[PDB]
Amino acid sequence: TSFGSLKDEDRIFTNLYGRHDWRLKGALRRGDWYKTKEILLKGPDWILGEMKTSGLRGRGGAGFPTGLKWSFMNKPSDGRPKYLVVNADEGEPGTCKDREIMRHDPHKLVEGCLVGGRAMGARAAYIYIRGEFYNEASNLQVAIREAYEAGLIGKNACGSDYDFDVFVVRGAGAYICGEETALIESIEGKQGKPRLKPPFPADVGVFGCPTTVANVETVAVSPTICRRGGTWFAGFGRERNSGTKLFNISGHVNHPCTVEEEMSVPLKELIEKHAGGVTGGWDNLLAVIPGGSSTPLIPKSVCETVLMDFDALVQAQTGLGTAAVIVMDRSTDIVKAIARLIEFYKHESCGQCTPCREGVDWMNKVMARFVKGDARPAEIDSLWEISKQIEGHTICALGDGAAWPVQGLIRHFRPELEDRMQRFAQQH
Amino acid sequence: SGVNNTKKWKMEFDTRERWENPLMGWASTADPLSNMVLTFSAKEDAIAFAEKNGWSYDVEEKKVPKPKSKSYGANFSWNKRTRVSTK
Amino acid sequence: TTYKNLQHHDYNTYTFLDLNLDLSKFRLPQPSSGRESPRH
Amino acid sequence: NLIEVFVDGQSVMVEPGTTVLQACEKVGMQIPRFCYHERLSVAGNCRMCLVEIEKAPKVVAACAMPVMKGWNILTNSEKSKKAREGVMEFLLANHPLDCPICDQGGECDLQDQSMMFGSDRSRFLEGKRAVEDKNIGPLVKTIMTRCIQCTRCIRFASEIAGVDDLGTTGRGNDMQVGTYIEKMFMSELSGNVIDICPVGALTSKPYAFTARPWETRKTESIDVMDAVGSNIVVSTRTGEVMRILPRMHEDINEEWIS
Amino acid sequence: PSGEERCIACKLCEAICPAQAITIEAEPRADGSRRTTRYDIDMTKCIYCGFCQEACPVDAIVEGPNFEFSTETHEELLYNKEKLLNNGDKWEAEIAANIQADYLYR
Amino acid sequence: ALFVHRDTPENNPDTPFDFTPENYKRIEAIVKNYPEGHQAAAVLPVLDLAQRQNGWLPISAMNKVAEVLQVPPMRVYEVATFYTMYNRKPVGKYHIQVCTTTPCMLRDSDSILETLQRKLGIKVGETTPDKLFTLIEVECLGACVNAPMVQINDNYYEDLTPKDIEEIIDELKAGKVPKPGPRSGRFCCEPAGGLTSLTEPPKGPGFGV
Ligand SMILES: Cc1cc2nc3c(=O)[nH]c(=O)nc-3n(C[C@H](O)[C@H](O)[C@H](O)COP(=O)(O)O)c2cc1C
Ligand code: SF4
Ligand code: SF4
Ligand code: SF4
Ligand code: SF4
Ligand code: SF4
Ligand code: FES
Ligand code: FES
């Protein structure tokens, strides 16, 4: 089984590069609001069963198994209403795969809000967008205006006996409000600080009311997981990790693209076939970051034989979140790159934990000293030790995503750091 | 926020007078049992020690903390007034 | 053919809040908690 | 409605809705704390309370977890002690070194936890953050440089003092705690913010520098002058009244004083 | 080295002084800084051990190398603060040279 | 910034701030959008609407948002100091903010910030003397596969050169808004030559049901 083709009939994210009528009455031409009434009248448990038999996982930075994640609350009513929340925040660097479905088909996101919200059993879906995503939020509420004028949302959920609401909640510019619970506190109207998870969002979410948090792909391939697949979507990918993925290939390449493809495609094919190859050839293409920022590095020695599965990248000592293929070449500055990652995490991080207040700033100061080289090589393994002291010792996985490319840089690019210690030891 | 002083019983005396020294304002006292604190492990043994030495005792019972119903899920309610606005 | 998202040039700085004004008459009656506030 | 909970092999039956701290307080083992007051709400911020939960690979916070069924909290384990020494190392990364300046000499709750629970030598050689001091009042002197951002003061001023004035501004190490504008935080119970604060960041202004808690002798009394009758530790140094502190009796005054 | 009495009311030098010979009751100075009102050094007490000069975090208390300070009456070996301050002002030309030649050892 | 208030006469709580009646209708549209229980959900878009009414958010506006929405003002200032979109310093009309983080930087964001400095005259974060352009080194703005990108006010200008700055700034200073979108031959984030996906015309209604 050597798949990774994804032929042009079986594309699941059509109208993505702009053409052929992104609004309503062109969205219904491409497949939207077609069998949605009988999808809602067939049953929510049938939609959750077609989530579980497809094996759709989390398309954000967590990779949590959906189906199971939405059957955390397949619950009867406890007095509170129920809500579906959409992380339209992107935040991780290199990751505008949600911006490209904000434009050119937000009606698929709106249909996914309605289908996933009645699949869990809910009242409203809150698409929370980033505070710099103004035209994206305006296109979202243009699609919400078209759906409400067509009568698809609100007391006739595509002409059914169901009431639903779809909102756009605008943020004000942080990556941390893309988290599963600082999402929730941002919509509740406070500092965007993530809650502790030992109360789950399925038990208490926004406003005290139980919620399901999902990413834009994680709700937006759902309304065509049930009008189009269930077993077809499970046939793509392997058994643990399945489906399609908006691969986001950026940095030092001749064609920077977002190509939607079959997941667990070779990364050789992701460089060469779609989004055509990097500058120079294959003397370059050292230091590929497979995901956005919560994935460590790869030293190009194993990168030719990398499958893009979650557990295969776990066995290849990384993770896979948003799958932003960030490519460096030999004409880069890798220590400046990862010190700019921890500069992003220092100037972004919400300041709640002790090992992300004064741990992330510590890693930023030591890696900013490692850029200039004016340190000694005895602190590289100590900075590795404080990276391992951050990892499981935080509230959210921004500590994980801040201490992981540190571990990738020490795991794969330690002799370049030793070369820079030699280069400063040449000076006086 | 500790327990290790609250764990063992103690025996202090009545605090008598402590005047200023006429030389430089030191704490000059005539009560040599004023600096005495005696550790213990049980109230019955401390009461038996005070009976066997003959001093009159004032016994105060151990004010143990009642365990509170502190849950993180009650900090974020839908109807109750115990919502925290700080986070 | 040609790039069809033409309105993202044409959006004014009040546009998304103006469509929130347009959609607030389309929204459902929102849930009530039994309390007017968290009484902060 | 009882749960069999193991704490290093013990057999404590605790009611549900509890914490790992309230499970271990029946044993007598005290998991170390900075963010959690007993009488304030749960908010895991300081991350000192990390223990391991019998062979799950992530250490969990003792503030937030209810103990589910049959968990063994290994309070004196290698992973929990490495977590405590790591979090104390990260707390003492950007702590400015004003311990001879400080009002809480022996009454620092973080000197004692670094002395009994942290590491030996800090590997910090970089440079500490400095925070502009505030003007909260003539009772609460706020040197906010040494604040560990543990948010124990803002939960008291939001929940029990009820003033809503102390909250955090910013993010990262640039997140600083206090009034954002020049606001005189002067309500009733504004002196209980000092004893809640485990750091000597905000302390008393009339007891600024006059004595020291190892030198003072701690006697007990009841209050006058308000008729609630609260238990008071009078800490006296050389026959001079130096501090008045609240003393815990859960009926009359549960660690507060006016 | 630029004016300004070095003692900052830490009170760890009587928690280490094993004779209990030091009373250092202090106040804020009403200038924003932190100093002492009282020092007391009892020379008819105290052990001459260097515990205070090893516990002083700023090296304010020091044990300058006199030994010619025998007095005739018992009042004159109760050094409060002013005798100590003009003693260190008397002996700062030698004490600072000893600390500058000795601070690599300690 | 500085994350504290230093009560200047340009930022005292007596600066003239009052919403229009259509703005107050928009405030109660936000209030009726949110649930009536927990109406302190409207701290972020109400104060964002205050920022859309005027930039350089004063403390009269940060007390006006609390006065309308009945939130405590310290709980308002928590939001207005945590979030990076909210501007408390005196900012300009056009407000250029440029990414310098890593996929957006590795294709040459150092030169687009350097040619911005050489075109304007701002070192890192101060203002022009005409108060037209201010530069803030923001971390990530989302749109990174278009590899250099700037953000004038509320629009994305992306995949562009200093030669593209030579018409964008030169039409922003002496003209209208110069067509917000990616330059250099791409349409949104397409392949530079050809298309990878959406090459076949799109699927039917219920295609492969
Ligand atoms: C620190 C952090 C930041 C995140 N940021 C985002 C984000 O900006 N956008 C997003 O779509 N998901 C984001 N996620 C992921 C979602 O919170 C999570 O994966 C959720 O379950 C949605 O994925 P799923 O549909 O696969 O379940 C973030 C997660 C973490 C822990
Ligand atoms: S890991 Fe960092 S971003 Fe996440 S809660 Fe802790 S301090 Fe905030
Ligand atoms: S509060 Fe800070 S400065 Fe004061 S004694 Fe403790 S650690 Fe030192
Ligand atoms: S001032 Fe004290 S109580 Fe408040 S956050 Fe800082 S250390 Fe905690
Ligand atoms: S003599 Fe030294 S240790 Fe003693 S109070 Fe003064 S400065 Fe502190
Ligand atoms: S040398 Fe004198 S003042 Fe110093 S601690 Fe020893 S005995 Fe006390
Ligand atoms: S003691 Fe639990 S996080 Fe502070
Ligand atoms: S990091 Fe540049 S906007 Fe993404």
Residues of B in contact with A207 (CB under 8 A): 78
E37 touches chain B (CB under 8 A): no
Cα distance between residue A113 and residue A86, in whole Å? 8
Name the residue facing F81 among D164, D170, D182 (closest C-beta). Answer: D170
How close, in Å, is residue D89 to chain E by CA atoms?
A: 21
Is E58 in the D-facing interface, judged by CB distances under 8 Å?
yes
- Nearest atom in ligand 6 to the alpha carbon of residue E13 is 5
Q: Is the torsion defined by CA of A289, A295, A301, A305 positive or negative?
A: negative
The whole-angstrom separation of Cα F207 and Cα A131 is 36
In the block, which residue shows the tokens 């605790």?
A: D14
Please answer yes or no on whether F4 and D164 come within 8 Å at the CB atom.
no
Is E92 within 8 Å of E59 (Cβ atoms)?
A: no
CB E28, CB D208: distance < 8 Å: yes
Query: For ligand 5, is residue E10 a contact (CB within 6 Å)?
Result: yes
Beta-bridge mates of residue D61: D50
- The three-point CA angle D18-D24-D26 to 5° equals 90
The two structure tokens encoding residue B70: 């502190």
Contact by Cβ (8 Å): F205, A31: yes
Q: Does D82 touch chain E (CB under 8 A)?
A: no
Distance (Å, rounded) from C-alpha A49 to C-alpha A65? 13
- CB pair distance less than 8 Å for F52 and C40: no
Residues of B in contact with A181 (CB under 8 A): none
* CB < 8 Å to F199, chain A: 8
Which residues, listed in sequence order, are joined to residue D72 by a DSSP beta bridge?
Answer: D6
Please name the residue ranges forming H helices in F34-97: 44-53, 59-69, 73-82
Q: Is F153 on the interface with C (CB under 8 A)?
A: yes
B18-26, Cβ contacts within 8 angstroms, sequence gap of 24 or more: B18/D238, B18/D239, B19/D239, B20/D239, B23/E75, B23/E78, B24/E38, B24/E40, B24/E78, B24/E80, B25/E38, B26/D238, B26/E23, B26/E40
| CB-based burial, F1-29: b 16+ in 10 Å, e otherwise | eebbbeeeeebebeeebebeeebeebbeb
Task: Report which of A146, A269, A68 is spatially closest to residue C26, judged by C-alpha positions.
Answer: A146
Of the bound ligands, which one is closest to the alpha carbon of residue D20? 7
Phi (first) and psi of residue A31, to 5 degrees? 105, 95
Q: How determined?
A: cryo-EM
DSSP state of A109: H
Structural domain that includes position B18: 1-87
Residues whose CB falls within 8 Å of the CB of residue D78, separated by 6 or more in sequence, listed in order: none
Contact at CB, F192 and A254, closer than 8 angstroms: yes
Q: Please report, as a single letter, which amino acid is at residue A316.
A: A
From A243's Cα to the closest Cα of chain F, the distance in A is 16
Closest CA to A232 of A219, A244, A240: A244
3-state SS of A213-249 is EEEHHHHHCHHHCCCCCCCHHHHCECCCCECEEEEEE
Interface contact C8-A103, CB threshold 8 A? yes
D148 CA to centre of own chain = 10
Torsion over CA: D100, D106, D107, D110 (sign):
positive
* Residue F65 backbone phi and psi in degrees, to 5: -65, -40
Instruction: Report the candidate in A224, A230, A222, A217 with the shortest Cα–Cα distance to residue A50.
Output: A230
Q: How far apart, in whole angstroms, are the C-alpha atoms of residue E57 and residue D75?
A: 35
Nearest chain D residue (CA) to B13 = D219
Which residue type sits at F126?
A: E
Q: Across the interface, do A349 and D171 touch by the CB < 8 Å criterion? A: yes
Q: Which ligand is nearest to the CA of E57?
A: 5
Cα distance between residue A256 and residue F147, in whole Å: 8
Q: How far apart are CA F184 and CA F123, in angstroms?
A: 28
Bridge pairing between strands F135-138 and F96-99: parallel
Number of domains in chain B: 1
Q: Which of D14, D36, D148 lies closest to D90 in space, CA to CA?
A: D148
DSSP D172: G
User: Which of B20, B26, B35 would you mutate first to test chain E, the one with the most E CBs within 10 A?
Assistant: B26
Which residue from D47, D149, D172 is facing A349, i.e. has the nearest CB? D172
Q: How many CB atoms lie within 10 A of CB E14?
A: 20
Tell me how far CA of residue C40 lies from CA of B72, C37, D163, F69, in angstroms: 18, 8, 9, 12
Cα distances from A99 to residues D60, D155, F106, F130, F185, in angstroms, run 35, 38, 21, 34, 19
Among candidate residues A88, A83, A165, the one with its CA nearest the CA of residue A120:
A83
Residue nearest to ligand 5 atom 6, measured at CA: E7
How many Å apart are CA A171 and CA A338, to the nearest integer?
Answer: 27
Contacts of F79 in chain D (CB under 8 A): none
With CA atoms as reference, report the closest residue to A217 among A127, A98, A130.
A98
Residues 6+ apart with CB under 8 A from A402: A341, A342, A345, A349, A356, A360, A363, A390
A245-266 b/e (C-beta count within 10 Å ≥ 16 → b) = bbbbbbbbbebbbbbbbbbbbb
Position A318, amino acid = T
* CA of A257 relative to ligand 8 center, distance in Å: 15
Nearest-CA distance C13 → chain F (Å): 7
Residue of F nearest to B85 (CA): F75
